[PDB]
Amino acid sequence: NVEQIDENLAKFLAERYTPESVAQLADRFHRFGFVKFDAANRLVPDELQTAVREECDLLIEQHKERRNLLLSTTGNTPRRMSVVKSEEIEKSELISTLSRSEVLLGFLAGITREEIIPEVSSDERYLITHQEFKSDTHGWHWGDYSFALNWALRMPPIEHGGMLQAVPHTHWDKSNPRINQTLCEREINTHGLESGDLYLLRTDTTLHRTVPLSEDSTRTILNMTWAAKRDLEKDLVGNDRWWENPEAEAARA
Template structure:
């Protein structure tokens, strides 16, 4: 199909043109593969677990194009960090990061997909309410790369309601890097109590292969990536979104500032 070829090789002078073409690709894709039963099943899983895998949200060709752009931007702009975050109980961050400004200056498909009306409409239906641009712009689009033994995005919550995560590259399951979640928890930045929560509630562990995509409640789901156990590569693209709950709670962004603002 011409639209798929365009998604694979987006050559446009204006990002608005890319957004329009991308929305056509996604609308056609959703009509073919996303049923009402699928929406209902995923919505219920999100309510139960605070998490759901939605790899079907993108055609494989579009995911391939997105991944190629992310890898290119990581190679050009990433910064290695090895820090601990006090607001999450001094949990570690050992990885390379790419920030919002990098993606806006270097990317085409990545920022266009964030703004896609078709994909946002799909997320609205899953969430049961509007999924909005993250109110804190610096948190809207970020990426991380883990590649050394011990690399991890340690236990934390998100400042805003939702994240959509694209697995650009993943190691085999025996290398680590799985997502671990404790849903239905709240972040007290003065007293995060992470070790207590780990002993009080079950920890759900999810493996994702290269090309997988998942959507989850980051503000009420304590989560981390299991540390890598050998040299390998795990790359993710993170879209952060706001929702209705974000309008009623004050926000601070010390975690984002420490990890991504450079």
């Protein structure tokens, strides 16, 4: 562990990725607000991901918090899932140091074409969403920050739902979200995911959701949220931090 994680990851990335291949991924990240790291574009060693998935499975069994609400700041889109707060995930030494790894952040900076600053709100650095029932979903929303590295730790079959639908090049107006109006004006990109996949999401300008589960399954994702230069010194508004506080102002039943 320790610095060997950064050293092994730096070797793990130098075997598959070049500046030219990263520049092609950067063009896709701007066009879609989304790039996927699957079997043909792996991001972390399989042993490292297994250690992260085992850490998340332990945090879930210890700190599972069921959520079933609607967020008024996002057009009353539902939040039907179980979550693990950011303060509980920070206690994991593996997830915390990896989220601030100068190797992982520096490499992904070539895809975002801008600095990836790990300075966000202490209640939003990390988030684990655990969907396991029918109609569980992460409704249409944006992100308060610019970037998010989501770990598709557990993915149900595609025929069972759970895909990530996205609409890039949008914005979040918490007083007038216009989610259904944006769908009428813009085409929706549906991104299928499999267990083990990772993907970078430009969360501030991509209206995105997860297709609700069509039956009882299991959908687990670890969220690593990072801020850009535009997110610094900005005031957090909305009173809609539903994951940390289930009784937030914007959180309705």
